[PDB]
Structure formats: structure tokens, C-alpha cells
Amino acid sequence: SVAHGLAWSYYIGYLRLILPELQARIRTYNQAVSQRLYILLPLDCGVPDNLSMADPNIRFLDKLPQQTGDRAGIKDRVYSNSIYELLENGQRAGTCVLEYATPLQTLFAMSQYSQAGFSREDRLEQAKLFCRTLEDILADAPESQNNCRLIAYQEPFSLSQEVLRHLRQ
Amino acid sequence: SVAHGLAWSYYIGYLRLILPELQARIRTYNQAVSQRLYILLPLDCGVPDNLSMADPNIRFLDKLPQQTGDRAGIKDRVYSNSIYELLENGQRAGTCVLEYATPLQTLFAMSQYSQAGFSREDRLEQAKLFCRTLEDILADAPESQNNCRLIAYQEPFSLSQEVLRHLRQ
Ligand SMILES: O=C(O)c1cccc2cc(CNC(=O)c3cnn4cccnc34)oc12
Numbered sequence: 396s397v398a399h400g401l402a403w404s405y406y407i408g409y410l411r412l413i414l415p416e417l418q419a420r421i422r423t424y425n426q427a428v429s430q431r432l433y434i435l436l437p438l439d440c441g442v443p444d445n446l447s448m449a450d451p452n453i454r455f456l457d458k459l460p461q462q463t464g465d466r467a468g469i470k471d472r473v474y475s476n477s478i479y480e481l482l483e484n485g486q487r488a489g490t491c492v493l494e495y496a497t498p499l500q501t502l503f504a505m506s507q508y509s510q511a512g513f514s515r516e517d518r519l520e521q522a523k524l525f526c527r528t529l530e531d532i533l534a535d536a537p538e539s540q541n542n543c544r545l546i547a548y549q550e551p552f553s554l555s556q557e558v559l560r561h562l563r564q
Numbered sequence: 565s566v567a568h569g570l571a572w573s574y575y576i577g578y579l580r581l582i583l584p585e586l587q588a589r590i591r592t593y594n595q596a597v598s599q600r601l602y603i604l605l606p607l608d609c610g611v612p613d614n615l616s617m618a619d620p621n622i623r624f625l626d627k628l629p630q631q632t633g634d635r636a637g638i639k640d641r642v643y644s645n646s647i648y649e650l651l652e653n654g655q656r657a658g659t660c661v662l663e664y665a666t667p668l669q670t671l672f673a674m675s676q677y678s679q680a681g682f683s684r685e686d687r688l689e690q691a692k693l694f695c696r697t698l699e700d701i702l703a704d705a706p707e708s709q710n711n712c713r714l715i716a717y718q719e720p721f722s723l724s725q726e727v728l729r730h731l732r733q
């Protein structure tokens with residue numbers, strides 16, 4: 396399936412490369428930010444560029460120092476991550492590296508382009524299969540050593556509360 | 565198929581975003597470099613990080629000024645491209661933005677991991693289907709306006725000569 400290929404490329408072309416170096420980048424920034432990469436997986440494939448627009452209680456703090464690596468003819472290809480503070484009744488309840496799983500934008504876009512041959516009704520099913528495949532990959536991956544957490548959800552809602560339930564172990 | 569999803573995500577998550585801004589970045593660097601993004605598509609899915617290791621006549625010149633954009637919770641996500649000089653009998657015969665199509669690394673890796681459920685024999689077929697799907701996408705895409713060229717090839721070989729045949733219109 397397309398969700399199967401998306402989960403494998405997201406692991407091979409991104410997670411496999413940043414998850415080994417992540418704790419070192421977090422330690423560097425901490426000179427406190429939590430140790431895992433928190434990945435938001437909205438099953439509706441709704442991926443806004445601004446997290447604060449999804450929930451005002453999710454607030455951008457700072458960028459994590461960039462990771463660079465020569466890859467496939469690209470000198471110093473850059474991998475960037477953002478740090479967010481999570482508010483709960485006016486209080487900073489958590490601080491973590493947080494982002495949406497970008498392949499869900501591909502599912503959203505493919506469901507909209509007629510040439511992609513993917514119906515708008517198939518988004519939910521493909522997102523669920525992307526989630527399951529990625530969980531199966533990370534469960535058995537050596538690069539994932541208590542440093543990655545997938546947060547999958549369907550709105551019937553507090554996004555910051557869903558993140559916080561995961562942050563609080 | 566997985567090649568279908570890879571071609572659509574490579575377009576949606578990368579090409580769709582950089583191809584509109586590419587001529588402006590090339591004009592900026594030129595204050596001469598050719599106007600198209602040249603994408604190497606080895607059908608054997610062999611993707612080395614160093615182009616000069618694939619052919620000594622392909623020589624790294626400089627980085628093209630980075631492109632940044634806020635995306636899916638990432639503040640200032642970076643898109644980087646490299647400029648190469650192409651030598652032919654000691655002479656600089658061309659200068660272009662050149663890189664390998666990264667999803668071919670996913671096909672290579674999936675053919676090696678038992679959990680991916682993709683045989684090592686299926687690489688060639690999947691790379692060909694990735695190529696055809698991407699050509700079909702770019703043929704009809706509004707972002708592609710004489711600014712992208714796919715260079716697909718099978719070794720029986722000069723890589724620099726294959727690039728140069730495309731560079732010379
Ligand atoms: O990297 C993958 O293995 C991969 C596999 C499938 C689909 C996609 C979509 C992307 C996004 N690309 C970038 O962010 C990017 C930034 N500089 N840059 C230079 C060359 C190529 N890509 C990029 O990567 C993919």
C-alpha cells in the first residue's frame with residue numbers, strides 16, 4: 396500500500412537518521428526539555444503549519460540545534476526540530492520536541508488530486524495503516540531507544556491534553 | 565503501490581515546495597548555473613552520498629542559498645540543494661543543481677529489511693514505476709515550468725556524460 400511505503404520512507408529518510416542524534420541535541424540545548432521526539436498523528440490527516448492554531452495551549456519555545464549530513468549528492472542536508480511548551484490552566488505543564496508526522500499531508504493531498512487515484516473517503520483508513528506500520532517499525536528498530544513517541548488521535552477536544560497524557564509517562 | 569506513494573510524497577513534500585522558488589535562488593547565486601533542477605534516477609537504486617565517488621567528472625562547486633518555510637509544526641524547515649560542475653576531458657562542460665532522487669534509497673532499504681515485505685529482485689521494477697509516476701506528475705504539474713529534469717538510467721558507463729546529454733537540451 397501507499398501508507399506502507401510512507402511509513403517506511405519516513406523511517407528510512409528521516410527517523411532512522413535523527414533518532415540516534417536526538418538525545419545529544421536535547422542535552423546540548425538543556426546545556427527542562429523532555430528526551431523523546433513526540434510525533435502528532437491526526438487520523439483526519441489535518442496538518443496545520445502552526446501548532447498554536449491547532450491549540451493555543453501549545454506554544455512555540457525555540458528551535459533545537461540543527462542536524463546536518465551529506466546525503467544523496469546534497470552537501471549538508473538539514474534536519475530541523477521545534478520545542479514547544481504545553482500550558483494547562485495558565486501553567487507550563489511540559490516542554491518537548493513536538494511535530495506532526497509530515498506523510499499525513501501526502502495522504503491528504505493524494506485524496507484531493509484526481510491523478511493520485513486515492514478517494515477522499517480513504518484518508519482515515521490510510522492514516523490508521525500508516526500509524527500501525529510506523530509503530531511496528533519503531534517497536535523493532537535499534538535507533539528507537541525510549542526516544543520516540545507517536546500520538547495518534549481522532550477528534551470527536553484538547554490536543555495539549557493528549558500530548559500531556561503521553562508526557563506524564 | 566509503494567513506488568506510487570513515494571513519487572506522490574516526493575512531489576507533495578518536496579518538489580511542489582522548491583520548484584516555484586528555484587529560479588529565484590539560481591538568479592540570486594548567479595548574482596553560469598543552469599535553470600533546471602537535475603534529478604538523478606539510477607534504476608539500480610544505488611544512491612551514494614558523494615556524487616564525485618559515482619563519477620570523478622562530477623565535482624561539487626557550492627551550495628545554493630537555503631530555502632526555509634514553517635511546516636507541520638517545524639519552524640523554518642530547511643530545503644538545501646547542491647551545485648556541481650561537469651567535466652569533459654579536463655574542461656568544465658556544464659554547471660547545474662544536481663542530486664539523486666532520495667526515495668530510491670527507501671526502495672533499496674525496504675528490499676533489505678525482512679519486515680518491509682519487498683524482495684531484493686523488485687528494486688528495478690519499483691524504481692521504473694517510481695520514475696514513470698513522477699514523470700506523469702511533473703508533466704501535468706503547474707510548479708514544473710521548464711525547471712525540472714529527471715535523468716533515469718541503467719548501467720550496462722559515464723554519469724557525467726548522461727547529465728551532459730540532458731544539459732545540452
Ligand atoms: O528524504 C527522503 O528519503 C524522502 C522520501 C520520500 C519522500 C520525501 C519527501 C521529502 C522531503 N524533502 C526534504 O525535506 C528535503 C530537503 N532538502 N532536500 C534535498 C533533496 C531532497 N529532499 C530534500 O523527503 C522524502
Ligand SMILES: O=C(O)c1cccc2cc(CNC(=O)c3cnn4cccnc34)oc12
Nearest residue numbers: 404405408409473474475497498573577638
Ligand atoms: O516531508 C515529507 O512530506 C515526507 C514524506 C514522506 C517521507 C519523508 C522523509 C522525509 C525527510 N525528512 C526531512 O528531510 C526532514 C527535515 N526536517 N524535518 C522535520 C520534520 C520531518 N521531516 C523532516 O520527508 C518525508
